[model samples]
Target chain A: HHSMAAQGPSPIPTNRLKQIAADACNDAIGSAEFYDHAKTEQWNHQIINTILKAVIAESQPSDSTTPPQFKFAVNSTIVQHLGMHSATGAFWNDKTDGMWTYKHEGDESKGMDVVVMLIWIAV
Target chain B: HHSMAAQGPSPIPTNRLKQIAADACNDAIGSAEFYDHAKTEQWNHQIINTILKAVIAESQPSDSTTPPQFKFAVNSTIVQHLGMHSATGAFWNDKTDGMWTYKHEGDESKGMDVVVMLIWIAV
Candidate 1:
């Protein structure tokens, strides 16, 4: 938002994932009308719910609330991914898959990018 | 789409995950204006990106451009997930983390819904 307002380089650094998002945001700001704060907030919620519905269906085939976008084909493996660290609210995790654990600089439970991939087979 | 046009049960049978999503959408259409095709597309993308940004921030603390929605708590773990089958575009996934792996009825790799959840600790 700040960038779009000022049209300057990103004030902060970002990871590959963030870099991609930033690029998209920048593009939107450059080409499209800058979304007012209200519009941005509305968009943000819509995006998250859509994603949740899609991924949840894949993880639990029993989930009936799956979106129409979800269509199963033979021999297909759906994958959903998520990342966390400082910006998002924290939850719980462990190095060895334990309860919400923390990893210090030298501690055995060093904070790592925890990824949970759900796999299933189509009928 | 046809089902909605008629207001009937989903033509497809899904796992547990899809059930939840279907419920949400049904309720939405039931109460809401049953958003026309145009409005649905607009909300779809917005929802997905919001989730992505939040998850990415939690996963990669190093990601500097994290969204304000992301707030680090002590020893918190964040997760992100995606699901696919007959719906959405197909990408690639291999068992043992292989390429767009497929699992048949009796085959070792059956066509199953896959989910990738990202979890990370806050700094």
Candidate 2:
């Protein structure tokens, strides 16, 4: 009865989160794929929401009770500043940019993990 | 005459840019002084615009011909990951967060400077 509701829904794993993020990115890009115009604010917001959902869905092994938090930026060039190139397969090449993760400040070991994903737009 | 028009407005010095950034931060924070609510998107946009104007006003000592570019992210915790703290005197404390500067990757020496300023809201 109430016992089943207490357990809640199972959380998505980290590996799956990455796929979700990539899929969202692809889906968003696909919508504008043939367009010759620049990306619009609506498109940007859509992608952010898509990725945010994926980030929130991720399960935290440390504490299942506490919810994970996410912060993201969607722009044209922030990733390049972080030393990451959008080139296919070059993500790990720099290892310095794009999709950075940080734990809360209060207690490094105990604080929740805050993930910041920077998505770079081609147009 | 045409000659004067060709020579654009003088750029702001780097030292001044920092002061301008800090000033902008203070001004933005001051506006929300009495408010008990969380930070709004409008306020966030205002701060970003303020910093952006300062960034654009900066003059590149290198080739005055080529304009310098800028990219910024305004959020709560991205700085902590970059190792930056919002403490009044703690900005320099971490040297890892808050405002960051990076040169474009194409040709480091010849590329433009991109400044990213992260402001943490204390609501």
Candidate 3:
């Protein structure tokens, strides 16, 4: 097809998702250590929402009439690094559906880690 | 629609998911604290793999002719309990798709938490 009919964003935009995750983390958890449990909830919420909204908007089709093409889920966790561990697994179509994880350096001073996961399923 | 032709398991089996998550955590991180980092990866993998396998097998259609009905993504996190925070958000259809989270109390002596998330998208 011609440029006019070029594909919307690739179904799996790994690099862009990383950038989005980084910006969201920097925005929400900048230079702040996880002190009060209350703030962690809010920061987690901010990170997830920011990344979720950006992923959808960036990947959405310009032509609304084309119907929905994908559904996305974002997960965020902030943990005090005491040599912790995490794992993610999926059961889905390998070719069309996929997931990505981003590790935010966070604040080394905070002594915590921020991890984000993005999953997209073809519609 | 009333008899055998009725739907398979509810797309979002919250109760079952909770059980699966708990069992996975119990199996993996049972009575273990955030000790030597080497074991954390194994525990995380065990938790995620157990849940992912059970979910797909449980919700899968009985007949192969039906093709696939849903795609799933599961995330597992383990952290020492220092008043940490976590959050999840989605840009997805509400009716036919959903997400669930479970918190495993873990071992009181360990002073840690095990959190798992399960997300499904209709095909």
Candidate 4:
């Protein structure tokens, strides 16, 4: 689905990935009131788990494939400060593997920014 | 260097990784007085680039090896707020690949937090 991966190394399309990240953030901490340290671990896990499953579903080789062809890594950071800035660099196979990042605010009512980065390596 | 990567998957030993990350942060933005938005991107890139090179040198297969045995990714985030929380999860070959994170405050005189995450996948 990824144009960059078309006839090449493919992961979920970027548009689809953006949607998945937003949905994951929403499903995990969308309505949460404040930054709860005790619950952050659980929330982060939930968000990653959701994205992992959703990505696998989208990248399935077959309708009921058991495993996907690509390896995945996802990071979800909750930042309360809008002034924060981030950057990433990779020493990797740019052709078969790559990374994407997105920031989801959930309409700003959530009082936090959910920054997600997804990495994929071909099998 | 990485104990987990030694005899196992070997990476730049975790203890060493910590040192590399801390030093990278210090070298990139340690002397800074304030979080200059104009310089954050450059700082972030500097931090990641420093860690990327050091990690490769640490994991090099041979003294003069041109390329390392693993693909690497490094991320640096500058957060103005100390209360920021972050989490990471990966769906990859757990045995051959992994991730590590560190927070370097540079003794808290820099007025920001430099959070870094490193990932390596066996080639």
Candidate 5:
């Protein structure tokens, strides 16, 4: 069960937590082949929605298409495995325009070590 | 000291590589008290600009306050310590409006484990 209360927030979003539990669980799931297949897009949605209620539930917000600008730049080995890191030049514009963007090295199909940078403007 | 090429990009950003190095270095700073004082705002700019050229240089885009939407949801113990984690009901709107926001446990001062989510639009 993904737990949001387990951690807190600062300059990033709240939905980006499944990676931690997912990676640990995937590692324990054994069978690299099975893990790969199980982690597919279709199944990911399913797992995130159910087993990862915290992760899924954390995705409630706006529906904008603007690139994120804020950044966390914290500890993220779990996210790296899933291909989410940081960028060199990223920023935001409005309520949904702060998801910094850039390129990577080994990640091609979906980029590598890329993590989102969320910022909750105190309202 | 901070290398972005060593990693790649995913659904997140390229500027978040700072938290990694910050935490690691801060950990090794040998003194939590000293590290705290040194990690303040004034000096962060200096280190990031000089020592962390890759980091400061990373903040070279956009001027918006969008909250960011695309979450990494991966391994993020680094972000946790820095107060950046995940949230529910977070999404995007246009080009800078996606940053899932939420709260955590034991964190009230500045929040905890907060990370920004960045999404790159294939242009």
Candidate 6:
């Protein structure tokens, strides 16, 4: 067997992973209006939890083959753009082999806080 | 004028800030159900953008004294608890004096992905 053949499908492309992340954000949090300070925490948790489930399910593999490896990251220049702070971080999932995290930065005094998410996959 | 008298209201307590952060998450994303893999991105963006607006509004002043200083951080042990990887890194928000970052680790083959958020404030 050729050495290259052992590599399996080239680790999923970065762009694809990015796209997956982007899509996950949109799918989990789209349709809702911007959250006001009074309701930011609740809203964020709802969204994060939602995305977590979605991404996890997406990563799930069929019984026929081993599942692909995955990595994900997210950020938001827009929040900073609006004159505020924002960040997203993930915790490793020991039971299932996954990770997830999120954050909000700045405050109403400065400006809006935007956030973005990223993800990677390999097989 | 007494030097001690000039201190102004005590800086917001860390617990308060944490409470604010927790409140923001619950308020912004609490109502939503978990998202399937197909719709994670959309959902996340919607939620983040919404919280950005809310947190900014919450930080906004009522044309009174200078607004309070604020900081925020977020994380999730649940993701890692599930047997995966997760971390959060914040990018400084130059325009507004804040930072933000997010990440998701592992894959479906490993386990589920969970996330968390944190914040702080001072006056």
> Per-residue alpha-carbon lDDT of model 6 for A71-99, expressed as tens digits?
32232222321211123322122232222
Q: Which CAPRI tier for candidate 3?
A: acceptable
- How well is each residue in A6-117 modelled by candidate 2, as lDDT tens digits? 1112244446655665565455544342322243334344545665555444433467675442222322211111111111111111222223222111223321211224
Give RMSD to native, each candidate.
Answer: 22.5, 21.4, 8.0, 4.8, 14.7, 21.4
Model 4 chain B lDDT-worst window of ten: B1-10
True contacts kept of each: 0.21, 0.00, 0.86, 0.79, 0.00, 0.05
List of chain A TM-scores, every candidate:
0.29, 0.39, 0.83, 0.79, 0.25, 0.40
Q: What's the best-to-worst order under TM-score?
A: 4, 3, 2, 6, 5, 1
Winning candidate number (lDDT): 4
In order, candidate lDDTs are 0.24, 0.31, 0.70, 0.74, 0.29, 0.35
The top-ranked prediction according to DockQ is 4
Instruction: Highest TM-score: give the candidate number.
Output: 4
Q: Which parts of model 1 have CA positions greater than 4 angstroms off?
A: A1-32, A61-123, B1-123
C-alpha positional error of residue A97 in candidate 3 after TM-score superposition, expressed in Å: 1.5
Q: Which parts of model 4 are misplaced by more than 4 Å?
A: A1-10, A63-67, A106-109, B1-10, B63-67, B106-109
Q: For model 1, how does the per-residue alpha-carbon lDDT over A1-123 read when each residue is reduced to its tens digit?
A: 000011112112224323333333333222333224334333333322333344334334345684232211111111122122211122222121121111111122321211211111121
Interface RMSD of 2: 20.0
- Candidate 2: the clashing residue pairs are B82-B96, B84-B97
Fnat computed for model 5 = 0.00
Ranking of models by lDDT: 4, 3, 6, 2, 5, 1
In model 2, the Cα lDDT at residue A10 comes to: 24
lDDT of 1: 0.24
Residue A10 CA error for candidate 1 (Å)? 30
Q: What is the per-residue lDDT of model 5 for residues A36-96, given as tens digits with 9 covering 90 to 100?
A: 3323333333222332334324443455673343232221221323211122223222433
- For model 3, the stretches where C-alpha displacement exceeds 4 angstroms are A1-12, A31-34, B1-12, B31-34
Model 6 Cα lDDT, one tens digit per residue, B43-82: 3444344444445556555676765354322322122111
Off by over 4 Å in 6: A1-35, A64-68, A71-113, A119-123, B1-123
Candidate 2 lDDT over B1-123, as tens digits, reads 001001112234446656765565456544342322244334344445666555544433367676443222322211111111111111111222123322211122322212233321110
Candidate 1 vs 6: which has more TM-score: 6
Docking class of 5: incorrect
| Cα lDDT for residue B123, candidate 6 | 16
